[PDB]
Enzyme design. Structure first.
Site, short mmCIF file in Angstrom:
data_model
loop_
_atom_site.label_atom_id
_atom_site.label_comp_id
_atom_site.label_asym_id
_atom_site.label_seq_id
_atom_site.Cartn_x
_atom_site.Cartn_y
_atom_site.Cartn_z
N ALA A 190 58.11 36.18 27.48
CA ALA A 190 58.77 37.40 27.03
C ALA A 190 59.45 38.09 28.21
O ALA A 190 59.01 37.95 29.36
CB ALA A 190 57.75 38.35 26.38
N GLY A 191 60.53 38.81 27.93
CA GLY A 191 61.22 39.54 28.97
C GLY A 191 62.55 38.93 29.38
O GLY A 191 63.42 39.64 29.87
N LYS A 233 65.02 39.75 25.83
CA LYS A 233 64.34 40.90 25.26
C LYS A 233 64.80 41.21 23.84
O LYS A 233 64.03 41.72 23.04
CB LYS A 233 64.52 42.13 26.17
CG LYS A 233 63.45 42.26 27.27
CD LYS A 233 63.68 43.49 28.15
CE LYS A 233 62.63 43.61 29.28
NZ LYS A 233 61.27 44.10 28.83
N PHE A 251 60.38 48.62 29.04
CA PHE A 251 60.70 48.32 27.64
C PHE A 251 62.10 48.81 27.26
O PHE A 251 62.24 49.58 26.31
CB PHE A 251 59.70 48.96 26.66
CG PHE A 251 58.35 48.26 26.56
CD1 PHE A 251 58.18 46.94 26.97
CD2 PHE A 251 57.26 48.94 26.03
CE1 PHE A 251 56.92 46.33 26.86
CE2 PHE A 251 56.01 48.33 25.92
CZ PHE A 251 55.85 47.02 26.34
N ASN A 285 51.69 43.29 22.67
CA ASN A 285 51.74 43.49 24.10
C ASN A 285 51.06 44.80 24.49
O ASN A 285 51.66 45.88 24.35
CB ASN A 285 53.19 43.48 24.58
CG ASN A 285 53.31 43.67 26.08
OD1 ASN A 285 52.32 43.60 26.79
ND2 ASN A 285 54.52 43.91 26.56
N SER A 324 51.74 45.76 29.46
CA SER A 324 52.83 46.18 30.34
C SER A 324 52.32 47.24 31.31
O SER A 324 51.71 48.22 30.90
CB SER A 324 53.98 46.80 29.57
OG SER A 324 54.92 47.33 30.51
N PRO A 325 52.60 47.06 32.59
CA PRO A 325 52.18 48.09 33.54
C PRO A 325 53.21 49.20 33.65
O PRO A 325 53.04 50.11 34.46
CB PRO A 325 52.10 47.32 34.86
CG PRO A 325 53.11 46.22 34.73
CD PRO A 325 53.13 45.85 33.26
N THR A 353 54.59 51.18 31.04
CA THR A 353 54.56 52.21 30.01
C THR A 353 53.24 52.97 30.13
O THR A 353 52.17 52.38 30.06
CB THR A 353 54.73 51.60 28.60
OG1 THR A 353 56.03 50.99 28.50
CG2 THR A 353 54.59 52.67 27.52
N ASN A 412 50.15 39.01 31.59
CA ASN A 412 51.31 39.81 31.98
C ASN A 412 51.39 39.90 33.52
O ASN A 412 50.66 39.20 34.24
CB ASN A 412 51.18 41.21 31.36
CG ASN A 412 52.52 41.80 30.94
OD1 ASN A 412 53.47 41.82 31.73
ND2 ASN A 412 52.60 42.27 29.70
N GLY A 415 55.56 35.75 39.36
CA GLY A 415 55.87 34.66 40.26
C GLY A 415 54.66 34.10 40.97
O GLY A 415 53.52 34.28 40.55
C1 LIG Z 1 61.85 41.07 34.57
C2 LIG Z 1 60.65 40.83 33.70
C3 LIG Z 1 60.58 41.41 32.44
C4 LIG Z 1 59.46 41.20 31.62
N1 LIG Z 1 59.38 41.78 30.36
C5 LIG Z 1 58.28 41.53 29.56
C6 LIG Z 1 58.19 42.08 28.29
O1 LIG Z 1 59.09 42.80 27.83
N2 LIG Z 1 57.06 41.84 27.53
C7 LIG Z 1 56.04 41.04 28.00
O2 LIG Z 1 55.05 40.84 27.29
N3 LIG Z 1 56.12 40.49 29.26
C8 LIG Z 1 57.23 40.73 30.04
N4 LIG Z 1 57.31 40.15 31.29
C9 LIG Z 1 56.17 39.31 31.77
C10 LIG Z 1 56.39 37.81 31.59
O3 LIG Z 1 56.41 37.56 30.20
C11 LIG Z 1 55.22 37.05 32.22
O4 LIG Z 1 54.03 37.43 31.54
C12 LIG Z 1 55.06 37.37 33.71
O5 LIG Z 1 56.33 37.54 34.34
C13 LIG Z 1 54.32 36.25 34.45
O6 LIG Z 1 55.02 35.02 34.31
P1 LIG Z 1 56.01 34.47 35.46
O7 LIG Z 1 55.28 34.50 36.79
O8 LIG Z 1 56.37 33.04 35.11
O9 LIG Z 1 57.24 35.32 35.50
C14 LIG Z 1 58.42 40.39 32.09
C15 LIG Z 1 58.49 39.81 33.35
C16 LIG Z 1 59.60 40.02 34.15
C17 LIG Z 1 59.64 39.37 35.51
O1 LIG Z 2 59.59 46.26 30.14
C1 LIG Z 2 58.79 46.13 31.09
O2 LIG Z 2 59.01 46.79 32.14
C2 LIG Z 2 57.87 45.09 31.16
C3 LIG Z 2 57.00 44.84 30.09
C4 LIG Z 2 55.94 43.92 30.25
O3 LIG Z 2 55.21 43.60 29.31
N1 LIG Z 2 55.70 43.32 31.48
C5 LIG Z 2 56.50 43.66 32.57
O4 LIG Z 2 56.29 43.15 33.68
N2 LIG Z 2 57.51 44.59 32.41
#
Ligand SMILES: Cc1cc2nc3c(=O)[nH]c(=O)nc-3n(C[C@H](O)[C@H](O)[C@H](O)COP(=O)(O)O)c2cc1C
Ligand SMILES: O=C(O)c1cc(=O)[nH]c(=O)[nH]1
Ligand SMILES: Cc1nc(Cl)sc1C(=O)Nc1ccc2ccccc2c1
Length: 365
Positions: free
Chosen positions: A65-66, A69, A118, A181, A184-185, A187, A253, A275
């Site tokens: 996710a993300g 969006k 969000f 979800n 998220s840190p 909200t 997350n 990452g």
């Molecule tokens: C820019 C960005 C936006 C994200 N937005 C969401 C989100 O809207 N909802 C969610 O559940 N996780 C969100 N995530 C978290 C990712 O879904 C994932 O849980 C997290 O980045 C760890 O995976 P990764 O290391 O492969 O990026 C976001 C992460 C990034 C980097």
């Molecule tokens: O929209 C966000 O900022 C977002 C949501 C989420 O679930 N995880 C995250 O890293 N960011």
């Protein structure tokens, strides 16, 4: 492969040097939605197929996710080679998210910090967007390429549970699985919904709404959790999941922690870190949640996956499926085939007949 090297050494660093991370992301979503992608030459072998959550997954590697969006690039993401796509988080009403800049690269750490908060087109816009391709998705899903929808809550919402319930009612019928979800840190107060009493109340309502949908439109419900939970928090989540019959967990997350050793200049920016520095924290959370749920609750493992070895470690720790996002930021689209190719090779080397045999393998040794 040549593509891997070209993207890793030339294209991505150039993209990154030319654009700030948010602009680069917007451009990547645009190119993806237009199918302007390098050739995903990799053919998924039978070894990579997984059956879980009431569905077949052609391979176990999804986009987290993300990235998409608002549900704009779903088909381009399958073309990239992902075995499943999760869109969101989507909030009930449209909202802008935090002021810019709100996303930061830490190239020395292969990490990103984001505080988007969000930003979302909202349920109505995403609903119409998904409805416009609903039958195409029905065929994709049947073909082993399911779609997940990740639900969030509005910043100004009084009643969090009603926000999630609206999401279930509006997007539930368009999803193979829904994600609540609560991790998220970015909200305020959101992560407190992971607490036992709040979580039980929230998920009871969510599941009631889900169960009220017609059968062919009834999605699996998963909860996405943080990597920063106390042992007590994890114990309580496992207990609620088993009490309510939640279908699965997404683990994890981003982290609000800043592990020792981060080198990036931007390491002290507020937000969730993703990452490579997140990888082992996430894997350990999967390992713990799998044990606490007795291996009976499907886990999608996510956090710092950039290779077949990363994927397999999460699978052996208990994940049935894995997702990635941040690795794309550094390595581009070829990383998907790379992860799948390496994963298949490692499964063979370690004597597994397929992905299914490796799930939770660490707990049986
Ligand atoms: C820019 C960005 C936006 C994200 N937005 C969401 C989100 O809207 N909802 C969610 O559940 N996780 C969100 N995530 C978290 C990712 O879904 C994932 O849980 C997290 O980045 C760890 O995976 P990764 O290391 O492969 O990026 C976001 C992460 C990034 C980097
Ligand atoms: O929209 C966000 O900022 C977002 C949501 C989420 O679930 N995880 C995250 O890293 N960011
Ligand atoms: C391959 C290609 N052809 C033209 Cl024309 S532009 C272009 C292109 O740049 N495609 C990209 C590049 C980086 C990406 C990073 C993440 C997700 C999708 C991505 C797509």
């Amino acid at each position: 492969t040549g593509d891997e090297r070209f993207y890793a050494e030339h294209l991505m660093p150039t993209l990154q040097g030319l654009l700030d991370p948010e602009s680069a992301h917007r451009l990547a979503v645009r190119f993806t939605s237009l199918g302007l992608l390098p050739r995903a030459r990799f053919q998924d072998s039978d070894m990579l197929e997984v059956r879980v959550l009431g569905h077949k997954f052609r391979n176990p590697v999804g986009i987290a996710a993300g990235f998409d969006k608002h549900g704009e690039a779903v088909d381009g993401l399958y073309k990239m080679g992902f075995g499943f796509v999760e869109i969101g988080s989507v909030t009930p009403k449209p909202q802008e998210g935090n002021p810019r800049p709100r996303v930061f690269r830490l190239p020395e750490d292969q990490a990103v910090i984001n505080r988007y908060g969000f930003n979302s087109h909202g349920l109505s816009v995403v609903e119409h967007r998904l409805r416009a391709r609903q039958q195409k998705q029905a065929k994709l899903t049947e073909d082993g390429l399911p779609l997940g929808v990740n639900l969030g809550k509005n910043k100004t919402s009084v009643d969090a549970a009603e926000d999630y319930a609206e999401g279930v009612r509006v997007l539930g019928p368009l999803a193979d699985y829904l994600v609540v979800n609560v991790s998220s840190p970015n909200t305020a107060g959101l992560r407190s919904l992971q607490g036992k009493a709040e979580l039980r109340r929230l998920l009871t309502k969510v599941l009631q709404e889900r169960d009220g949908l017609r059968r062919v439109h009834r999605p699996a419900v998963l909860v996405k959790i943080a990597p920063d939970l106390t042992s007590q928090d994890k114990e309580d989540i496992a207990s609620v999941v088993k009490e309510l019959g939640i279908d699965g967990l997404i683990v994890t997350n981003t982290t609000v922690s800043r592990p020792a050793g981060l080198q990036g200049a931007l390491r002290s920016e507020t937000g969730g870190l993703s990452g490579k520095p997140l990888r082992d924290l996430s894997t350990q959370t999967i390992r713990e949640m799998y044990a606490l749920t007795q291996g009976r609750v499907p886990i999608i493992g996510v956090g710092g996956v950039s290779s077949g070895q990363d994927a397999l470690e999460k699978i052996r720790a208990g994940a049935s499926l894995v997702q990635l996002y941040t690795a794309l930021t550094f390595w581009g689209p070829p990383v998907v085939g790379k992860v799948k190719r390496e994963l298949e090779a490692l499964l063979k080397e370690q004597g597994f007949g397929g992905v299914t045999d490796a799930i939770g393998a660490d707990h049986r040794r």
